[PDB]
Design a protein around this ligand. Structure first.
Ligand SMILES: *[C@H](O)C[N+](C)(C)C
Ligand SMILES: *[C@H](O)C[N+](C)(C)C
Lengths: 495, 494
């Protein structure tokens, strides 16, 4: 099977970049160029937002009902499901994640559009929600209107699914949007532009611009007619996005990954837990914004736990993502490959011992492949304990008391997620409340349902996506307050 | 007889570390009537460390909303009991008519009582179940306080604007550093003693007065402050957000505007004219959501503006304590100048001061200005675009409904708007089309704590008050639990 060659998706049609640049698509499994994607610039950003503004002003989208827009979202979920095999293949070759992971992403893409079709519908009965006032002179209610034209910026670790997390609620709210996917993985998002045509989404409601960060993303963020930005990616970049938005006091949401702890107490089924620790740091080839990449395990069961950890870890088949049984593919790019190696490198140079992994798999000579890696004998002053590695790399420290666990778990500038393992469910509740985190998993790690709110605190960003919080990111909450008295205010004296 | 206070930090009156102070001026007499402490970065540092420790103790942040509500109601009761005191200190510090001040102070009691209620509602939302489509998992939502928050409030409603931020943050279980404006800091400092009188735990609320750059900017940039709530000018708002961005800390912004009041032909002119006066001249014109641009129909224009000036004419411009005062001095001479500059610049660009434009005839000193009405406007004029923040109104005609809509939305701002018309269908159509955060229908300016407040566009973002107020200060925490005790079954068992 080959790969699609697309132009930019603007105003319902396929448009060459104005400066005509393209950049390559590399298969992370082979390090070879397998195609290329259009590379948008500020000039293309300008025509996409003009088209999005034009579409927002038309009589067929933004002032329509939630139920109406829901028919489009359900059509998308259907289409995505209909073209299921096409999207998982592309996602697998583009992102490098195992085929099996890929199929669950495309399943989750359709589920997300379904869920928000529902949220669009439920939005209709929330309109003109009454606000009881103290004074019978006045009455009040709330309108939930679409905010306007929005910029959506989505990362490459779940390419289509991270885009949908932003596309779905924004379209449910009645906004029109410009999507900027990551240059490292843009193939399925571009294909999404066809789905839009095929379901008859009005032109300009969604526009998809691929390209480099400074060229396609930055102009979107700084554009004077974009009302809001939703960003997911690195904390470093998120700071730059917000600095830029601040010039026009433009609102943002940010989900900036983290350094999430997984806290394991003495009283557990060690074989079920070790699999969750593996899933929480090595699944998605370790490229998980909510990676439980700090293991804190009670020294009581430490040795045994670490033992069976390496045991399960060694049994992880590392291979090309299309081959049956693959549980770990290559990391996304050479830049990322180098960065992870430098993290491992610097780790031992600060005197930490690479218990397992830490290098290419000898049996794979090409591709950005890395061994699932367990780092031990860790100080809390080491770079690898502080910083997001975004590769299959796990740090490990033991703890004495519950209070030491909590303090260790919370000793980070980040605060996206955390997981806590213990059969003592009273203890689980105590730890859950104490964690300085936006998402806590109890006796599991990493399942993210569209039904529940998602985001972080501290340097992991702010705002909640998904669930009943998703739509609200895209709304103008309009207060409307009417004087029904028909009588002089009576404050000023009449002449 | 104005109080002399130190900084309120950790439940104690603490002297600024560099022990500087700055004047307090009665806007009516231009005389230094006292002084307030001026904090520096050092003071911020110890006040934040004080809020943080207070947040870690076990008598505030992890307690119930209901527990914290008892303090909220106690505060509201104490303010009510000390009403006369606060009303007078506000009237002399801020410069709004005594009558405006009593309403303000009533409103801060009511605001603390409302959010006591919302704190109690908050307990009822803890562990709200979220239905999952997998039997293996259950989920719920916890609503926990964010942490230490920086609250920055402006001088046009000194205690009220501060209250609007203190009340939800404390309701949420946060601890707070408050930095009021240097131009009206006395009731806010005085609020400190109220906190001790009710037994508010030390460090839960901290009150640093001072200069923006010495006191505000270091709060905004402090690495242990979790969030900033800001009301003020759009220009400063850009700056606080830019600064907060350095550490990706969240922000709410309400940034004033250039709000239109649209008046159609089917209106009782005298009622509508009075509201128009209220919309632009009340609070001495220092209204963030001032409806400062009158869009009035052709067929009823010149009539409307005559009776308009005939209302503007007998507005008593007295010292704020005198009887019947319906307009007072603006806050400072700094502000006085740039409002004057705004008016001369209007004449130069070829506008006509249909009334006012100068110093009141009968009041020789004080930063007083007559209620000003400006016609003969082109939309390219400075006075049409920019926020004056003074008792100055622009008027323009229109004739199409689609024309009024376009003129009303022809601003980079988007805080509020007022629309007047007996036909309520037309009211509905207009309120939907206005690119704005709040629409008043057949009135202008009533703000109830019950309803969500905030703007869009250049006027900022975020909703305060109402059932939106508390959630600005919350960590919405997802908690999803595996209740299967079965293997996940992803990888292969060794
Ligand atoms: C839930 O698991 C969310 N991510 C983004 C990591 C898949
Ligand atoms: C109500 O009018 C809102 N303000 C800020 C003016 C009090």
């Amino acid at each position: 099977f080959p790969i699609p060659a697309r132009q930019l998706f603007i105003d319902g049609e396929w448009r060459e970049p104005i400066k005509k640049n393209r950049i390559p698509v590399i298969n992370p499994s082979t390090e070879e160029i397998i195609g290329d994607i259009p590379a948008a610039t500020a000039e293309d950003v300008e025509v996409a937002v003009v088209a999005a503004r034009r579409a927002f002003r038309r009589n067929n989208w933004s002032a329509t009902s939630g139920a109406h827009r829901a028919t489009y979202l359900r059509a998308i979920a259907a289409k995505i499901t209909e073209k299921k095999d096409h999207f998982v293949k592309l996602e697998t070759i583009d992102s490098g994640k195992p085929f099996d992971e890929a199929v669950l992403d495309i399943d989750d893409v359709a589920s997300c559009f379904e869920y928000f079709a529902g949220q669009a519908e439920a939005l209709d009965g929330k309109q003109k929600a009454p606000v009881t006032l103290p004074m019978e002179r006045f009455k009040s209610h709330v309108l939930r209107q679409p905010l306007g034209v929005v910029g959506l910026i989505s990362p490459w670790n779940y390419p289509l699914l991270m885009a949908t997390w932003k596309i779905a609620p924004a379209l449910a709210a009645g906004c029109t949007a410009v999507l900027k996917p990551s240059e490292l993985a843009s193939v399925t998002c571009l294909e999404f532009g066809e789905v839009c045509n095929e379901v008859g989404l009005p032109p300009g409601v969604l526009n998809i611009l691929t390209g480099l960060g400074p060229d396609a993303g930055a102009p979107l963020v700084s554009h004077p007619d974009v009302d809001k930005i939703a960003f997911t990616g690195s904390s470093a970049t998120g700071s730059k996005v917000m600095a830029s938005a601040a010039q026009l006091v433009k609102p943002v949401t940010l989900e900036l990954g983290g350094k999430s702890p997984i806290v394991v107490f003495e009283d557990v089924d060690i074989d079920k837990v070790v699999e969750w620790t593996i899933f929480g740091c090595f699944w998605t080839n370790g490229q998980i914004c909510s990676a439980t990449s700090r293991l804190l395990v009670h020294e009581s069961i430490a040795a045994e736990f670490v033992d069976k950890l390496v045991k399960w870890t060694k049994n992880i088949k590392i291979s090309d993502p299309f081959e049956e049984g693959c549980r770990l593919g290559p990391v996304i790019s050479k830049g990322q490959y180098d960065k992870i190696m430098k993290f491992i490198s610097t780790a031992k140079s600060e005197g930490a011992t690479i218990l397992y992994g830490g290098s290419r798999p000898e049996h794979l000579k090409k591709g950005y492949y890395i061994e699932p890696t367990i780092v031990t004998d860790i100080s809390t002053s080491m770079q690898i304990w502080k910083e997001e590695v975004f590769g299959p790399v796990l740090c490990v420290k033991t703890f004495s008391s519950e209070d030491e666990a909590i303090a260790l778990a919370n000793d980070t500038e980040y605060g996206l997620a955390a997981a806590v393992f213990s059969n003592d469910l009273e203890r689980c509740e105590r730890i859950t409340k104490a964690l300085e985190v936006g998402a806590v998993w109890v006796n599991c790690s990493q399942p993210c349902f569209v039904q529940a709110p998602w985001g972080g605190i501290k340097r992991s960003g702010f705002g909640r996506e998904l669930g009943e919080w998703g739509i609200q990111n895209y709304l103008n909450i309009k207060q409307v307050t009417q004087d029904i008295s028909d009588e002089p205010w009576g404050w000023y004296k009449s002449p």
